Design a binder for this molecule. Sequence first.
Ligand SMILES: [K+]
Length: 130
Amino acid sequence: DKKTIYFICTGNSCRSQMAEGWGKEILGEGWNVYSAGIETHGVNPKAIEAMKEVDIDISNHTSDLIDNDILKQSDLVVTLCSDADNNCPILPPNVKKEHWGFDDPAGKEWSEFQRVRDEIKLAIEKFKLR
Ligand SMILES: [K+]
């Protein structure tokens, strides 16, 4: 019935966390949305604040490493950064993978953090229209 999308960024901190938040809202009807990373950097407080601004609560999200069982059941694995794309483990044959590159918002001025958040919204909206 429900399909599964898996958002991956290096530390499961900013990009993948915002993508999970947007995904649960926009694709929530027929999609199970999860996020992971190559390493765990913790859920960025700025990502929680960025999502709170658009009335999406991601405060209960966790920073997790990639799980082989979630990978196995994924219909689409989406990598959100170059490092995550290149270091993503060998995927099961039936699982599709796409790289949706976004700039690293961590280290950028607060306005640019919000810009990346909204670029992610747009990519997820376009995905729903496929
Ligand atoms: K997660």
